[PDB]
Design a protein around this ligand. Structure first.
Ligand SMILES: O=C(O)c1ccnc(CNCc2ccco2)c1
Ligand code: NI
Ligand SMILES: [Zn+2]
Length: 330
């Protein structure tokens, strides 16, 4: 079996290998990449997402979210307070202000230490889940707005035509902005491209050990667990690497830099934080290997989790027994 220790693998495709997205994902899996839950892909040197980032300041962040923490430094929840709209130019200026800017630090490890020591004491503002794309329409390889749709994948694999669309989202970050521990909707894959700015640090649990993370989360967030059997779907829980190590949870970490892709694999729990002002683009995708994960994915039926119209069909076709209860929640 390839990659038995479930290490995060890093790939350097050539421009020829970068031509067929599905083929390359299958190749990575042939080398065991999926066992980690996360892989890094460094694009060929000939490739670019677009010409420049000089003309992005007039994008609107209609609902910036202030991420307010509760708990202890290594075990906390965050809630999202809605703020007034602002442009990307205004947001960048805010990110770079004395109140919000990245502190002096020696290296990535020092900044990680500062994050976990100090995150709960601040409330950074995140520009999340903004429908759109920054890929040039003439970028022909790994263009996140031009991937095969999940609906077409389900149809090719299962023979059922369904409604729904699948489009990319933009994420504008600043120092300490945080993505909580989660898997993707329906335990899909994701692909994430860091277009511009400062790095993003990721934590990931191997899919084969996801239930270990779930068990710890139930113990660490007992009221949330009583409220919902799939409360990690709420995307509010943070657990530090120190706490994970104390509890024997297998995980890995890696830092993504501008110009790099990350792929998350089905049922790979992940979390992380931004180093400073940045912009990422992400989308969910599927392969034939996803279908059996989609059938088994937990669902939030308590009303809290934010679900798109497109998830209806996935639940309806893959999880007909659950559909009734899940719809009552949505
Ligand atoms: O803030 C982030 O950089 C971030 C990191 C990881 N996971 C996510 C959310 N899931 C991916 C996805 C698929 C479509 C849109 O997002 C966000
Ligand atoms: Ni994600
Ligand atoms: Zn719930």
């Amino acid at each position: 079996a390839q990659n038995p220790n479930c290490n995060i693998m890093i790939f350097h495709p050539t421009k020829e290998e970068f031509n067929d997205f599905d083929k390359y994902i299958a190749y990575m899996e042939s080398q065991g990449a999926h066992r980690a839950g996360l892989a890094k892909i460094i694009p060929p040197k000939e490739w670019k997402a677009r010409e420049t980032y000089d003309n992005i300041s007039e994008i609107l962040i209609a609902t910036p979210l202030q991420q307010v923490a509760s708990g202890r430094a290594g075990v906390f929840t965050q809630y999202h307070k809605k703020k007034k709209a602002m442009t990307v130019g205004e947001y960048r200026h805010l990110a770079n202000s004395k109140k919000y800017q990245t502190p002096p630090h020696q290296n990535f490890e020092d900044l990680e230490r500062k994050y976990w020591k100090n995150r709960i004491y601040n409330s950074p503002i995140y520009g999340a889940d903004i429908s759109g794309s920054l890929f040039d329409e003439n970028t022909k390889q790994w263009n996140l707005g031009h991937l095969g749709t999940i609906q077409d994948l389900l149809e090719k694999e299962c023979g059922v035509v369904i409604e729904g669309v699948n489009t990319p989202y933009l994420y504008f970050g600043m120092w300490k902005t945080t993505f909580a521990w989660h898997t993707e909707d329906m335990d899909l894959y994701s692909i994430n491209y860091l277009h511009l700015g400062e790095p993003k640090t990721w934590y990931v649990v191997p899919p084969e050990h996801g239930q270990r993370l779930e068990r710890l989360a139930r113990e660490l967030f007992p009221g949330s667990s009583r409220g919902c059997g799939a409360f990690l779907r709420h995307k509010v829980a943070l657990i530090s690497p120190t706490v994970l190590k104390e509890n024997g949870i297998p995980f890995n970490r890696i830092t993504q830099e501008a110009g790099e892709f990350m792929v998350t694999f089905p049922y790979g729990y992940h979390a992380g934080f931004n180093h400073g002002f940045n912009c990422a683009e992400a989308i969910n995708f599927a392969t034939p290997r996803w279908i059996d994960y989609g059938k088994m994915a937990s669902q939030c039926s308590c009303g809290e989790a934010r679900v798109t119209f497109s998830m209806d069909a996935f639940v309806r076709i893959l999880q007909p027994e659950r559909y009734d209860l899940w719809k009552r929640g949505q």
